[PDB]
Amino acid sequence: HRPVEWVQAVVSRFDEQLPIKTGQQNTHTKVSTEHNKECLINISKYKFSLVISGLTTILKNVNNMRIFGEAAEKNLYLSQLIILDTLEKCLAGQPKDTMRLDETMLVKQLLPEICHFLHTCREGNQHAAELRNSASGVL
Amino acid sequence: TFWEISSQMLFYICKKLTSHQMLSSTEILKWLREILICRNKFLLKNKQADRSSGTPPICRQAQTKLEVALYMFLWNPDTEAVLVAMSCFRHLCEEADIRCGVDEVSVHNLLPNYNTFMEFASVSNMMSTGRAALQKRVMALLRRIEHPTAGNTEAWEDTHAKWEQATKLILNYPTDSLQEWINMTGFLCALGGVCLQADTPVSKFMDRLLSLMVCNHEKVGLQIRTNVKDLVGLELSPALYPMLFNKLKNTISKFFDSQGQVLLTDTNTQFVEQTIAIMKNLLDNHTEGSSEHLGQASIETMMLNLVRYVRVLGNMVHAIQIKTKLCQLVEVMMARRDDLSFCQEMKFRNKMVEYLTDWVMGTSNQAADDDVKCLTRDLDQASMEAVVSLLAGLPLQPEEGDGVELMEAKSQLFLKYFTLFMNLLNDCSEVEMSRRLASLRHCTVLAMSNLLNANVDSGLMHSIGLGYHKDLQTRATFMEVLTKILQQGTEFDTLAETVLADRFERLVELVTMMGDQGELPIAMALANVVPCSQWDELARVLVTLFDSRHLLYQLLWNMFSKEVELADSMQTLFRGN
Amino acid sequence: KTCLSPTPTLEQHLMWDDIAILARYMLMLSFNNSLDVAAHLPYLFHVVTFLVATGPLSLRASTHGLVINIIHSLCTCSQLHFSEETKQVLRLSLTEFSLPKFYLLFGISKVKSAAVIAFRSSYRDRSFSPGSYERETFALTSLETVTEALLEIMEACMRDIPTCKWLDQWTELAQRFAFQYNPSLQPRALVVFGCISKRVSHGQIKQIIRILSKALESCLKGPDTYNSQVLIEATVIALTKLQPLLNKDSPLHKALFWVAVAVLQLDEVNLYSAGTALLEQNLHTLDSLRIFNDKSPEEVFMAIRNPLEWHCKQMDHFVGLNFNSNFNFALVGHLLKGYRHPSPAIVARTVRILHTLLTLVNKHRNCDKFEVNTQSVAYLAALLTVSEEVRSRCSLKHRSNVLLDEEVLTDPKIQALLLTVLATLVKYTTDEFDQRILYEYLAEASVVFPKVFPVVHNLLDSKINTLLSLCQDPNLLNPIHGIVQSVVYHEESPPQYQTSYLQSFGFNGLWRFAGPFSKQTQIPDYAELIVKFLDALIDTYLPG
Amino acid sequence: IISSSSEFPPQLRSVCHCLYQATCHSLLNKPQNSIGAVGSAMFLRFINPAIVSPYEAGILDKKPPPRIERGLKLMSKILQSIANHVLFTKEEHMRPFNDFVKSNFDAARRFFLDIASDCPTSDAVNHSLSFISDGNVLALHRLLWNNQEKIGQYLSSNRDHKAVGRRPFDKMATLLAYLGPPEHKPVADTHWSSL
């Protein structure tokens, strides 16, 4: 009960440190926000379903966000780069449980979002190259 | 080959960094820092396997160049560059240990300034702050470079040429550049001591420095003068006081022509006005070892000449403010009189009181009929405080311009001031702003009391009239000072041998209280609280007192025990300051 | 004659003016030994104590001047023959009373000179014009400082004066007001009686303990609290001084440990502060009698509590702590509220009480005074963040002995309480150094004792949640991450112990009793059993 | 130096013992010899400086001839090596002298032991001079008055176990106030001077 509410703070605080989201100087040299990443990655080992589900919503929110400007585009590109990089580490970090009961998340929550990047994505010549490279490893 | 080649690389790269500024200079330093780390381990293993470790001329010729490039980066505007440079001193110190394990033989001989270098590490391990705050700590350590060194004596010169050329360009042109110049100026001052020792670059630096206090440049002249005063006064090395005062006095000395006639000039007026703040700031700051340097120079001649120029400046709202500060400057000069050196204290103090009495005119703002001139109240109020300090313990001595009996001359001299104070005392009467008169009245009453104490015999008769004064408050103060005179002895009379010895007999007992298990709380507590400046006085009193009480062993055991236990290097600390 | 018509304060009494005017006469007569001190000194102090720091600023400075002149007359009296040794003490005393320390004690702080305020120049042309009716408060501790300074002066003189009766006369005057109901003078007449009395009888003690029962009774029954909230503190303070004079073999020497505890439960800074002072000397006094040499504090205090255990059991139920289940943990929850006392001087007093108790339990078990065991674990948790030797002698294993040893702490209860202490100490504490040390020891407990850890979620839930959202300290945030990971790691299993496990065996109020002092100072309303408890103690231990 | 053990002043004898006790106490909590450190330190800092530059110390009015001075400088190095029991390393210039120092290792130790053998408490050694020391007292009173507030703060931090009424902190305020403010310092005819 109480730990369930604790997890949301870890997940919620991650969103508030996305470049697209106002920085607010909460990074504390990025050590504090990076420590949050480590705890979230470790938690996925026992709460893989919960951690994965939260990440999908964050990616969907970032994907379904309209912002214009060089800084805005860079923030979204860097924002998704961390999300994709964070997601891949959790998948790789997870032991070889071989639990094949994640079809629900894969079919709807995860595949459509990753499939968007796999397209040519000619909007950004340099950003799409990195996102596809990161997404391909996850796939 | 490793030292032959690795060292040869260091000499090439270090010379390039000093040659000119580059965009990636902050990056070479971080990489160059790692190069030192990667060659210390090789020496450690090399010495362990085979001491045999060679130091060819390139190793010495390149070890110096490493220092010559670490100092010049201490004043670098980039915060990271200076922070990295401070951390880079660890590798320089640690290298000494590997070459020679015994500290004293080589660590304190090959690297005389070893102890200060260790301090840089602690400062680096601190929260980041603006360059101004960081420069204070950096310049503090730069002022503690006791031992001259080839790197020190060459880093000072190398940046001196760079600083000089930068200064000319700014003035020649009829903001970022200035900020670097400020850092170079402050850096070039804190480390002056190493370059000390006729014509010398250090002396030429002062001459240009003194020639910048009066720098009148329409574009940035104000900022230059605003900053040279702030830094030179508050940051100069105490080892440069004997040279600053001599140059400062000589500059003033030529302001007066033959026959002692002032030559008023706006630049000379600005020069004296700046000299007041610098001297006040210089005297205001109390640091370790500053007292030792103040004794060498004689400040009497400069002070006497200074008042004459200000004395003839005239009367005006501006001139009153200058006179007010001068009165405050002399007040600060009387708190370090023990530290200062005086050839004839009596002859100098008497003249200063004579020169100051001219300015203390009461009720002169009412005659002027202008409230704008209320500053004269402060100037008179400030003047009294200066005279009070001057009069504290000063016997009167009349100038021998006329030949008369000394006793008569002194009595006339005493009544000259006694009347002056009484006249001002009447004006301060409430019946005739309350804080101004109340504060001024207190000072004027205190001034007379000090005058009587110095010479009771020649002034006792003139003061009897105060017993029946019109102000009840004044009468009380006179009786108190009079009461002390009775308690004092006219002669030795064995009065202190009996009264003071018994009166102060208990004093030693409290100080010499044998705390249980040798705690000695008074001695231990007194040691830390006492400022470092007076440690010389404290040491003699403690040693002398305990020896008389046959308890010296207890004090030594307690005092040494804390030092030895606190630092395992008992011997090193004892030789240290 | 004020007893006939008792008043809440002297200034409100009808005869106030009569006393005030009579004070001015005594002030003038003090100078130049116009008041015969050599025969009236006992009666001068008796009245000075009732006037110190009472009345308008003019009247308050008058009392200070009166004392200054009474001492001077003694030093300049020819009828008495004081040796040169004694006269030195008096001369030093005269200087001491002129220090700024005594200005605050008399209530004349911020006054440069008392004489100037005491006298007014234009006293013939116009009458005095009192004003600034706002009047500072007085603390009975200040009276002790003055009350004992004078007693030093009196004792020195009596050494020279043969067969002097000054002390006997002064005691008699106090004894009359000590055992008489007067809400305006009785509080002042009790703080001085104990400071000067040299002997006590069984009947006297019973009155002191039986006046407290009525003082507590008045507070709850009526709406006037502050009036009766100072008679309680005076009763304890008086007893705090009479224990060192009690018989070496009196039962009350041990029964005065429960009275102090019952006073700390009233949630008042003054009452709580006074209780600790009684406890501190109670332990020291018992040490001189060598009563814990062969027994433990629990054995002694619980042995004397047995005859009236039935009444005590009811009180323990309401407070939410039990001493039969665990004496050393119920005796430390009451001592954890001291950390919340505004005065920095009471925090140090409770720390001394902790050290003294720790050295006694270990000495009973001969465990080196710093070993970790079941009995001496409660006293070490409190001292972990304030005692360096405790931290050094008991260090976390994952950096001598290491705290949290599971070899001896193999009981869920003995280890559940130690977690309750740790959670409580962080719930209200606000310090980076203290929180860091406490959290580092909490992570190790999570893994070493996973089963009992989930009973501490509610206590740490709010603070951790707030810290996690906004904290930006890597040093303090790293231990938090380990705790959260351990919780999820040890999750997925049904809680063997729920959060309410402490309520099962009585200790449901351990966290509540250590909270901050309530601003709305009010009687907890369960003191009605303390009155019954005290009554049983008197009948059982004071037959007559 | 070894022969003149008796001529050592009593004051220094107490000072040397304190270092010996400090080193012995330091070693206990931690083959270093306490006497060796004391002997090396005392000789290097007390005896050695006078030998190197007697003129600076004022022993000789006229500066010794440079040739004589060189012998004194080299003498100090040889003598210091004896105290430290260190042979000549990469010092072939002076290596032949290493033989002489070997015999004198024992002699140096005896001199250090004599001073270091003084009783920790001078119960036997007594000198009831009890001089008034009026001049020194005057400085002490002035210093205490100047730091009356600051010295109190240090006492305030500690001593909570027992009330300060009977302890220096209470006594200092009472006694110091009784004495009153110190008198003004007298003027100095001589120029500024230091120890």
Ligand SMILES: [Zn+2]
């Ligand atoms: Zn001279």
